[PDB]
Structure 1
């Protein structure tokens, strides 16, 4: 299993079905509508991974027939926040599907994230964050890439989604086709709001250079690099 949940109260049940497809019964959403899931490992292979945000049974694209997620207590998650709480980087080599009600989707891993032929299904917005979520008394306040020089890598097989895409990291190295409704890439050492407004920035001690190679198939692309002196190479 590529995805290994944390042992604690934010660890969802993760099961393998079929020929290796992972099914994640995400944890009960809080009052903000956030399903906050914590992981020791978060990796996706070509069989893909399905996050059950369904209030009634049905057919998933990647895992066939699934029952409803009864953790949801009749209310689907608005945001599925997946947080790696170990030192293990993430490798995403297949599709990630939200089964049931469309939601916003976040993966945070301050140790690094690599995408190569990964994608997102039934998400309104998907965000990859090489950094940590920020909490105050149980409430999500935003995200941080402070004190971090690690990499978001996008491989030759690219990344695809029909929804919005955010790429958030100290630096980004992309070598493949990125397909999305909109692409927002924010680089450097920053604190963010929940909506990825930049609230503060550090100047890195050494250059944090990002590289984008290959096509971007999107009608709207924004690249913001706050590392003063550092550049974006295309």
Structure 2
């Protein structure tokens, strides 16, 4: 069970099929179109994971035939927000597919995220956030890496997506090929809007250095480090 949902009302139903592929019946989206899913554990292996964002049955890439997700009161999620609410870090070693209607994807884990040979299928935009989402009366107001020194690690087997990629963490250490339509990496201790505009920054007490090694296969790359005096090493 790489993925273990929270017991509470934001915990989706998670099932394994076939050779270990996990299928997530995401929770009903709220009025902003956000399916906010909370997890005690979130990890993906080589068999991959499929988020059921379908209004009709059909064939997924990773898990074969799936029925519609009956939680979609007739409207699919615009954003699939996956939040780790425990102290467990996340390891992403396989593909994640949005089955059904293409959507935005976020994984937020303030304990750390490691992606080695991970990928995103049928997402317009995928964001890995070593930090927390911020809510105000059940509405998503943005994300925070404040008071956090943990790491987003990208391994030698890289990260692939046909959509937009955001990489948000106090520090990033990448050693593999990153393939995306566009890459945005934002480092340091920051608050962000819903759309990853930087709203405020802290200076870390000690250096938060990021490393990029390997290749970036994308027509547009932006790296913004707000940690006054810390490095971006290539």
TM-score (norm 1): 1.00
Cα offset for 1:150? 0.0
Query: What is the aligned residue count?
Result: 234
Cα offset for 1:54? 0.1
1:212-233 C-alpha deviation (Å, 9 max, x unpaired)? 0001000000000000000100
Cα offset for 1:123? 0.1
Separation in 2, partners of 1:21, 1:184: 29
Separation in 2, partners of 1:189, 1:121: 29
Separation in 2, partners of 1:195, 1:217: 23
1:156-209 C-alpha deviation (Å, 9 max, x unpaired)? 000000000000000000000000000000000000000000000000000000
Separation in 2, partners of 1:228, 1:190: 12
SS in 2 for 1:72: coil
Cα offset for 1:138? 0.2
User: Partner residue of 2:196?
Assistant: 196
1:44-93 C-alpha deviation (Å, 9 max, x unpaired)? 00000000000000000000000000001100000000000000000000
Cα offset for 1:26? 0.0
Separation in 2, partners of 1:138, 1:32: 10
Cα offset for 1:14? 0.1
Cα offset for 1:122? 0.1
1:109-154 C-alpha deviation (Å, 9 max, x unpaired)? 0000000000000000000000000000000000000000000000
User: Partner residue of 1:216?
Assistant: 216
1:27-55 C-alpha deviation (Å, 9 max, x unpaired)? 00000000000000000000000000000
User: Partner residue of 2:15?
Assistant: 15
Separation in 2, partners of 1:231, 1:113: 20
Segments of 4+ in structure 1 off by > 4 A?
none
Q: What are structure 1's unaligned runs of at least 5 residues?
A: none
Separation in 2, partners of 1:84, 1:28: 18
SS in 2 for 1:30: coil
Separation in 1, partners of 2:63, 2:225: 38
Q: What is the RMSD computed on CA atoms of the aligned residues?
A: 0.2
TM-score (norm 2): 1.00
Cα offset for 1:13? 0.1
User: Partner residue of 2:132?
Assistant: 132
Separation in 2, partners of 1:231, 1:224: 11
